[PDB]
Symmetry: C4
Subunit: 476 residues, 4 copies
């Protein structure tokens, strides 16, 4: 009958292993292109990560060597957050830094060379008038930058209370030999340096640092072993081929989505002429694969990630952030997607059967426990903020109470109180003993017991059929 | 009948979602004022926390800049607990500190200025006579403070064995620009400084520190951008409106408490004329809402917290401790109170059904395990106190054995023993191996198994009715 | 009958709450003396701990002040394990230390004074002959100490390869004011100092340290506030009273032990004339209380602990180690013993019902898992000993694998490898990934599941009687 | 019948306690040689570990003393990874190191003496031409080492951009007295030193270190206490005896393997003539003991380990790595093997019954969760690599996410972000909050619930027989 026709095509709509569906009758390979996609996407991501990692290593080493070249009294391994608290000391610092830049060729071991320029920016208030003795001040809140230019020993005067910030900016060129000679990547390193003196807090605490922005290019004229060389970028082609595969498994699985859609309304509309039932929810959910949706999303993300890696390599800005985040989140979703093809073996379906059956319940529970958490987190923030080093911004408080839910860095917290206000110090102890002894044992063990319970129920589903659907009664 | 009348009003006394009670017949909004309360109380607490946080940031920066201005050989990032062990060194220190205060205008970068005064307090024993060679001493235990006053290089003599303490006290005024210009808060900073030399232990170990007390005020005459300004405090009004809302949800829920009270004796006294049973416990407990009690408590605490924030802002002492603790504990209870309105959805009641059904049992268990804990904690204190850095005061021992219950900072503990007394060193290892291997696995896993078990029982309550009460038999 | 007579006295042999036994007919108080014992023993232990703690605090402060007085280039907070690697440096060190001792009165802030003496011990080999160039050495392994005595600048010659060790020994007297004036404790502090130079390893690494031995006495002639004083030790009397109470609850509970014994053979021998069964095990176990045994043991330990605290206070050696360990382990057992009297309430018996029913099974399991642990611990020791900072002695390896069972200091371990030998470095990672991923999840979760299971079974015992004993069938 | 004959010999093939098999009729001892093996193998491994440990202690002390003798400005306890950033500083360093080697006899405390030689290796590029100003470079990538030899103050010129590395190599002989005099081990210590200056990264960051290779020998002419001595190595004989025992328990258990094999085909082939069933899997698995296999493997490994310890001691290279790994993994397997003889008691079989019944399921589960883990680990690597100190190489990322699964070093991770790129900084927080809150609670609690469940099933196996095998139906 009509019934048996439509249900008969349906029976092989749903054959879960594509091995099992093809087992009916022969179809040319699709799944092979998805395995190819995995191998591609991850080979791209690895080949990317290694290169980027070498460039980062070089920027790290160089910015360290700079920290010791241009910061007076940087301890020859490392010091950090170094600040100068007397105005004679700020003057001595400035004089030193500039004198190092001008004497850089005698001083430095590195191949650092100038570009063919030291910009001294001084940002002070338009009309600064401050008299803490009178307990009165008068200001116009503009910023006027009186600048300098130094060429490869000056005179300067800085009225300090007027002074908002200072800066030193000089370009330096470095050539990286190992990376260029061994492999083909751009090996010219332009370095912009900014030595900034934050007076913004106006605490009398002059804060110094050294910022490094590294813009890559290629050496125009380049000779290896007496010959000449030009870097051939094959990864340029490789990105392309990965966009191709990813596009194909975009399309094929889009058709796999919409075909099933039209079979879903085909099914439900069929169902009225005969049995006249609905399940607008159950078997619309059923036909949507939901793993195909993931393949499509990680596909889109891999396309845009690859394109951005391609422009970012060609035009060669090398900021890399928004490209890395995409091309990473994609491979995360792809490798996640491999679980289905583990599942075709059928000895592993439990993690994504119960992880899907656990979520509808946990989400409810999680919400209700999140109310407690917030109400806890605020009070921790304010009451503990003046004193405890960890509770300062609201977020850090979130990483404390999340660290402590998981029982990590505990005794640190009890011992980092300042003890200065006995009342508050004691409060913190009621706070932490409370939170730990509630949100670990009670709430956590309730949550974990919830998931394990769900695992029991899905276990005996795996043992005795499943919840019976009109579909799976009707396909059988 | 009479029965059906009283029970009939009762049926809608208990309609749990106020949505569900109003579902009967229309009532004007109350619950809306409770949601308004939440939004208020937390907006107050956040707007408070941010301001207080900025004031703390400024005090931190400044007291650091002071630590480096007035303490000889403070390493230009930080050193801590710095102490001077030769009397020549104490003299050099004092001379330095005073000389910095008098030269402060040449030295400092900050806008620190004097107030229109250096108080040198020297606290020595009345009749000090000490002769450790004779193994004999004679003292009269009074304290006589021979003081100084310095005005913007002295002669001083300190007999050291007589000397109990020393101090230097000088006011310094600092103006904070960023906070005043960007937002309206008091921006005058009075600083009292106390440089204290503890000889109290008389170990030959002279301990130094720098204490900072910051009293806020407002700049009398103040001009921004060529104009004049006066800070308008709207948060003054905001505190008021929050006291109002909080008072209203105090009153309305008090009536909600007592109304149910008179219905509880109305119910139980009714019950004698007919069925002649009691449940003096069960359904007196039932009528008291217990969530209304919380709303009332967090309400009181929010009232007093707000008033204290208001006086503390107006009169402007700015100690802030007892205000912060209240206004925090309140918002903690309020956000906790949100769980009920999550519960009206009815997919979340499990956490506060089982968290209430778990407490009567756990409390018993907890008590019995607390006996073990104390008996463990004392022996740890004394036997381990001379040697292990962590076990010193009794409390710290409490935070060790609580840290170790939760398995945090373990190898630290085994490695911090002093090994000097082999017998005791070995004892500590029997101690810790024992405690960990008992109080984690055995007692903890028993406790967690208790709560999870309770969760099972309340789960199948959620599945099949509840324990049957004469009330809920009688309302049905 | 005879049966009913003996069983009739037995029925009140076993009345578990002594409240419940006295409920029969009146008996004078015993249990009151046990509560008195608890209050005593712990008040003794606390009053002890505080005093000892103050003496430790003073020794700590003083030995620090010494470390900075007599060790050249001790950084004015702390340095640790400081060693001198050139012979010119050792000479300069020695000269400095001695010069400080002789100039101590100008130098020190403290009240340290000599006793009415600097002993320079030099331990060198009898016949030292060493020639690492010839790859040949000749020695006679004796120790001959050529000593000195210095009186308040020398000439010295040390042949270094012959030199085994050096030492400086000088007594210094310190008077502690706060403790004597505020409370009555001995306040004379004799200090023996030993500055030792370990050359024993003969690595060219000369290791220095400062050892402190503090012998207490009382100031002979002592005047407070113009009057005279002698410290009255009431704690001397207090120790006595505690020995008394402890002795009484020794005796009374010994009789409680042997009475039940003679009722146990009385019972079992009775049982042959009639029913002719044995339970040589079950109801010999039953009559022995097992809590009385604890009271007796903690009693003995409290007696000896108190006596040793009394001699150690009177004769006043003040080593304190073997006294502290006893008097601590006792109070640990006593406070543990309080659980029974919590149990008389009868809402708490579960922890010591199931903790006793869990032990016979766990002990078996524990043994079998200990085999795995040892076999793991050895291989960790040897294979990882040359490289990983943590695995060195066998014991430390035991505290690593115990730290890691409990999941504490993990990333530290993976990051502390030396990476020098790639093969071994990789081995350590198979080692740790293996051990963690076996001995946590598998073995630990098996153990914890064992205890929780036992808790289930004892729960439904608490619900439906118990295992039925011929006794408890026969007393009923 | 034939059936009863073969099954009758079989009944005592399988008697699990060899005590229980011998209980039939007397057999001479085998198991005694296995207990002897355990005692041997571990006594060898301990006696080895101690010796090796003393040699390591001496190398550690000496290489430290060297770090302070030859590295300018090594802080007299320790500094680490010390690097020199100006070419004047590199020159001063070199001059210092060499001057220390030549003056070593005045300088050092140790008995270090030369061997009867300072090799200065300088590795520079063949044709170095570098011009970072032109953004052009030309190189021929060879390495040409222009060397020196110094004999107990030079002139040197190093063109720095050409310079790849530098080195200083000098032998030093040290005699260790304590080890030779107290026990018989080789006590001559040859030290090769390499002071290496890595310029390889060409960051301007010249990295220095001190490498130590220690080759042991024996002192040719050696006299103790006026007499003469030659070290008698009895451990040479001891290794032999252990190889013997290990070989015997190799052979005997090989026969125990193959005998059971021929009884397995004897059994299955027998089974066709009568009942005609197979179980090619079940009872081929059954006859293979699987514990004998372990004894054989740990036996092989102990043989090769012992032989390598013997050659490595005689020829005396003392690299020790591949010997230690073997001789360790063996004793790990042996002590593991002890569990069976614990099992003969029969109160402990549960751990290796359920640990074997848990593995077939977990392995499936573990695989599927490993897919998630990898896909997570890559994205963590790349997206977090530029910034987070922990995520750098892929492996370290593996030890982060394994550290965090187990909840160790958490707050460290949230606080080690660089915050420089707000987008990425926020990403890391979605990353970590996600991973922790999925891979701990959900996946971990699922895994642990799996093992505990398996423990339940094997528990009630222990209670009611086992899965019934035609064998154990047929032997009965
Ligand atoms: C380095 O200093 C010398 C003088 O000491 C000078 O002759 C030389 O030009 C300086 N280096 C450079 C690159 O100018
Ligand atoms: C107050 O302001 C006036 C400028 O009108 C200035 O001359 C005077 O010095 C100020 N007072 C102090 C204490 O600095
Ligand atoms: C700073 O020192 C100079 C002398 O070097 C003196 O003239 C000046 O008055 C000092 N500063 C102040 C604020 O007095
Ligand atoms: C003992 O006290 C007397 C004062 O009566 C003093 O002169 C003498 O120096 C003291 N002894 C010592 C050793 O200081
Ligand atoms: C301290 O040194 C001075 C000389 O500078 C000397 O007169 C005095 O006696 C010394 N102190 C003591 C206690 O001898
Ligand atoms: C070897 O020993 C002799 C003493 O007999 C000594 O003179 C000679 O210097 C030694 N050799 C070396 C290299 O020190
Ligand atoms: C140590 O230096 C002195 C000169 O101060 C010299 O005579 C002696 O020979 C040096 N040591 C050695 C072992 O040469
Ligand atoms: C470019 O290279 C030439 C060598 O042909 C050299 O003379 C010139 O100085 C280089 N330019 C710079 C800026 O160093």
């Amino acid at each position: 009958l009509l019934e048996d026709q439509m249900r008969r095509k349906l029976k092989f709509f749903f054959m879960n292993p594509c091995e099992k569906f093809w087992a009916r009758g022969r179809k040319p390979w699709k799944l092979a292109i998805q395995i190819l996609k995995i191998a591609m996407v991850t080979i791209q991501l690895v080949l990317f990560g290694l290169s980027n990692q070498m460039v980062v290593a070089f920027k790290e080493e160089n910015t360290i060597a700079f920290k010791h070249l241009f910061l007076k009294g940087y301890m020859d391994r490392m010091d950090d957050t170094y600040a100068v608290y007397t105005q004679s000391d700020v003057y001595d610092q400035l004089i030193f830094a500039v004198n190092q830049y001008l004497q850089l060729y005698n001083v430095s071991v590195g191949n650092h060379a100038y570009e063919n320029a030291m910009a001294i920016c001084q940002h002070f208030y338009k009309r600064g008038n401050i008299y803490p003795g009178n307990d009165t001040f008068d200001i116009d809140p503009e910023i006027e930058t009186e600048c300098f230019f130094v060429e490869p020993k000056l005179n300067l005067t800085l009225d300090f209370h007027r002074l908002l910030t200072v800066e030193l900016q000089f370009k330096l060129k470095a050539i990286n030999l190992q990376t260029v000679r061994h492999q083909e990547l751009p090996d010219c390193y332009d370095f912009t340096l900014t030595i900034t003196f934050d007076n913004k807090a106006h605490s009398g605490r002059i804060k110094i640092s050294l910022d490094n922005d590294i813009s890559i290019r290629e050496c125009k004229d380049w000779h290896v072993s007496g010959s000449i060389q030009k870097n051939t970028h094959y990864m340029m082609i490789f990105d392309a081929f990965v966009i191709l595969t990813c596009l194909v498994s975009l399309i094929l699985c889009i058709r796999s989505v919409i075909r099933g859609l039209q079979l879903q309304q085909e099914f439900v509309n069929f169902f009225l002429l005969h049995y006249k039932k609905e399940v607008s929810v159950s078997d619309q959910m059923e036909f949507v694969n939901g793993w195909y949706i993931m393949i499509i999303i990680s596909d889109i993300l891999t396309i845009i990630g690859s394109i951005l890696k391609m422009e970012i390599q060609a035009k060669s800005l090398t900021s890399y952030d928004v490209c890395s985040i995409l091309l990473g989140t994609s491979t995360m979703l792809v490798w996640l997607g491999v679980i289905r093809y583990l599942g075709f073996f059928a000895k592993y379906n439990l993690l994504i059967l119960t992880l899907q059956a656990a979520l509808p319940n946990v989400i409810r529970f999680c919400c209700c426990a999140a109310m407690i958490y917030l109400g806890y987190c605020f009070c921790g923030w304010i009451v503990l903020g003046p004193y405890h080093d960890k509770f300062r911004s609201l977020n850090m408080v979130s990483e404390c109470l999340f660290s402590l839910i998981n029982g990590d860095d505990m005794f640190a917290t009890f011992a980092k109180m300042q003890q200065k206000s006995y009342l508050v110090w004691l409060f913190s102890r009621i706070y932490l003993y409370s939170f730990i002894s509630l949100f670990i044992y009670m709430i956590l063990s309730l949550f974990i017991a919830l998931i394990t319970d769900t695992y029991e129920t899905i276990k005996q589903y795996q043992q005795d059929g499943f919840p019976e659907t009109e579909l799976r009664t009707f396909i059988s």
